[PDB]
A paper describes a structure:
To reveal the molecular mechanism of SrLDC, we determined its crystal structure at 2.0 Å resolution. The asymmetric unit contains one SrLDC molecule, and the dimeric structure of the protein could be easily generated by applying crystallographic P43212 symmetry. When we superimpose the structure of the apo-form of SrLDC in P43212 space group with that of SrLDC complexed with PLP/cadaverine, the overall shape of the two structures is almost the same, with an R.M.S.D. value of 0.72 Å. However, remarkable structural differences are observed at the active site. Interestingly, in the structure of the apo-form of SrLDC, the connecting loop between β-7 and α-8 (Phe178-Thr187) moved away from the PLP binding site by a distance of 5.0 Å, compared with the structure of SrLDC complexed with PLP/cadaverine. Because the conformational change disrupts these hydrogen bonds between the loop and the phosphate moiety of PLP, it might severely impair binding of the cofactor to the protein. Also interestingly, the conformational change of the PS-loop subsequently causes a more dramatic conformational change in the loop connecting β-8 and α-9 (Phe220-Asp231). The loop, located near the PLP binding site in the structure of SrLDC complexed with PLP/cadaverine, moved away from the PLP binding site by a distance of 12.2 Å in the structure of the apo-form. In contrast, in the apo-form of SrLDC, the loop is stabilized by the N-terminal region instead: the main-chains of Met1 and Leu228 form a hydrogen bond with each other, and the main-chains of Pro223 and Ala225 form hydrogen bonds with both the side- and the main-chains of Asn3.
In particular, l-lysine decarboxylase (LDC) is an important enzyme for the biosynthesis of cadaverine, which is a crucial platform chemical with many industrial applications. In this report, we determined the crystal structures of LDC from Selenomonas ruminantium (SrLDC) in different crystallization conditions and observed that high flexibility of the PLP binding site seems to be one of the factors that lead to the low affinity for PLP in SrLDC. The monomeric form of SrLDC consists of two distinct domains, a PLP-binding barrel domain, and a sheet domain. The SrLDC homodimer is formed by a head-to-tail contact between the barrel domain of one monomer and the sheet domain of the other monomer.
Numbering used by the authors:
A (entry chain A), B (entry chain A): 1 to 140, 150 to 225, 228 to 380
Write the structure that this text describes.
């Protein structure tokens, strides 16, 4: 199960009929990522963190697979709502909610909410009386209550008429270590037992996301999941457990196709200007501190090269001292691992359009494969 | 001529009928900025760098004042086109242009282009034969040709059938010093004289933008402009001169109104969660490295406080150790100097909506003033 990657040959045919920049998403790779987690982490229901990639066809696919969704705003709920997904398939997992989100949640039957602060309680009580709440704990600044505050928060939520349902945590570092998940599970187990004595019965546990990215998927990743799963089955036999994969689901299912629109050859280091930049899909360099494999298809010897985005900004520099062949205006390059926290942070700065996401499975290139 | 600033009283009335976050733009302040530059820098025609703020009503206002526009993409041309602005009022001042931009330029009668590289010539020659070109010089990495390459570039453009029209430079640091503008003017004067001997007659000079921001406007800023203007009248009596103000035009004409939607009071330092963040108008913290005056309207004693945005991201932190009164959910705060490179870099990340820009002059609060 390889990471999705267009061939030089497919790049060229796509770009003849689709103007660059564009992204190409493989629904089959998304499905493979989903089934892999199902196979090796069966105990955890999936709350897909759609903030990572909200492409409508990806969301429809996941929903038909049985996925639930972690939503952060009215906007995300609205996107899902248009695809026929109900609030019963959502959790409003933004710890601090606004009026619009709360109204959308009530409109679309979202009953599950997360919170970490006493200030969030009355607002949820008024907006969705009797709703199910999970307290977010910090097992380690912006989010999560102190472990030893968790059950008083759930109790206060119960006092205000909400249903104290469970606990969630986030411990994913994108490391292969299971230690941090397993550790969190032991803390959660203790709080679940203490809660029973306080007149609460907790039923759901959410272990968050931030899984390691799949190999350009592999056995070590499968083994980590099996190990998490074994601890879940041991510790929480009768509890509904959930995970919130985001990057994991789509990061490796999408690529970016971008054209060289300018060169500068006067420096020792040649510069190539691409038609997508740091204000577009590469915004993930700014916000996500991420790096994306760049593939140039040139034959010849290569020299350290700079790639810049199309903006009038000086900051729109993508790669420096990158070994690359001599490229010319009109050449297409290919950037992989472009599925997560890239397109979602794109802007209309300078009036540039949002690069569209094209579905591979709907293209002649797919049948040929 | 003060910087635009809503009163506590206007904030409250606005927010009762407009849900936060929203921006409020003062057309009168924009006009005042424009007329100020006209008054003190009469020689320079204005190419408004709309990338800084493309609010339709601001653009309509400027166009009716006689402003021209510096456009960077098809998208920007399209925005202007919908407001009845013609390409005769535009310069396509992105040194590396794409197919869509070039097609929009031909559709909307844009005849003026800037360039800095030999690779850009043939593309412009094919797209807009005979168009007027200005070479961008570096007087100081992404943009600008070496000074001593400038006239060979203009000559090569002439060879390909384009019209060698002039030169532009960018030297604005947002310092009060005129030295850098004046210096550039002497370089330009030398190239204009050399060009005459090479069979070119240059007619237009563009001195770029990056003016100092107007005082929370002032006499020192007026004096700088008068001094630039005096050197323009001396050096370039018969040349059409232009400037590309961006930040200067609107930065001080717009404010952001945002609500406290959550608090965290358990730390020594209280945290306030606002309904606009780093993925929205405060994206200028990321891309523009800028700082925005924050005004809280509270009565009481104040303590170092953190303000965070509404996102599920950890990075959405706006102000730390900021002296602030005790604020509560539902309180509105006010951020000034929010007119430039803020809204333009906002995203739909997490599904959040783009904060809309409301025109002050269309509000009951304006008449009351
Ligand atoms: Mg993940
Ligand atoms: Mg159990
Ligand atoms: Mg300026
Ligand atoms: Mg002259």
């Amino acid at each position: 199960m390889k990471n999705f990657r267009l061939s030089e040959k497919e790049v060229k045919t796509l770009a003849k009929r689709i103007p660059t920049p564009f992204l190409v998403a493989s629904l089959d790779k998304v499905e493979e990522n989903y089934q892999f987690m199902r196979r090796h982490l069966p105990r955890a229901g999936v709350f897909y963190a759609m903030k990572a990639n909200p492409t409508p066809e990806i969301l429809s696919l996941l929903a038909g697979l049985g996925s639930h969704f972690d939503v952060a705003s009215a906007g995300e709920m609205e996107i899902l709502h248009e695809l026929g997904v109900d609030g019963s398939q959502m959790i409003y997992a933004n710890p601090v909610k606004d009026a619009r989100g709360l109204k959308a949640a009530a409109d679309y039957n979202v009953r599950r909410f997360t919170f970490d602060d006493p200030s969030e309680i009355d607002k949820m009580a008024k907006a969705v009386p009797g709703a199910d709440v999970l307290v977010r704990i910090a097992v380690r600044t912006k989010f999560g209550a102190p472990v030893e505050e968790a059950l008083d928060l759930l109790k206060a939520a119960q006092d205000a008429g909400l249903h104290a349902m469970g606990i969630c945590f986030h411990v994913g570092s994108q490391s292969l270590s299971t230690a941090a998940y397993e550790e969190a599970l032991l803390v959660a187990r203790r709080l679940f037992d203490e809660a029973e004595e306080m007149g609460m019965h907790l039923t759901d546990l959410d272990i968050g996301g931030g899984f390691p990215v799949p190999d350009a998927l592999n056995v070590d990743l499968a083994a980590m999941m099996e190990a998490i799963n074994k601890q879940i089955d041991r510790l929480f036999p009768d509890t509904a457990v959930w995970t919130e994969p985001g990057r994991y689901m789509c990061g490796t299912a999408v690529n970016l196709v971008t054209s060289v629109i300018g060169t500068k050859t006067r420096g020792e280091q040649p510069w190539y200007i691409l038609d997508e930049g740091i204000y577009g899909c590469f915004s993930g360099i700014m916000y996500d501190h991420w790096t994306y494999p760049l593939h140039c298809f040139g034959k010849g010897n290569k020299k350290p090269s700079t790639f810049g985005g199309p903006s009038c900004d000086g900051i729109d520099v993508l790669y420096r001292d990158f070994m690359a062949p001599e490229l010319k205006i009109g050449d297409k390059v290919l950037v992989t691992e472009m599925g997560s926290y890239t397109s979602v942070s794109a802007t209309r700065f300078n009036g540039f359009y949002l690069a569209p996401t094209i579905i591979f499975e709907d293209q002649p290139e797919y049948a040929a494969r």
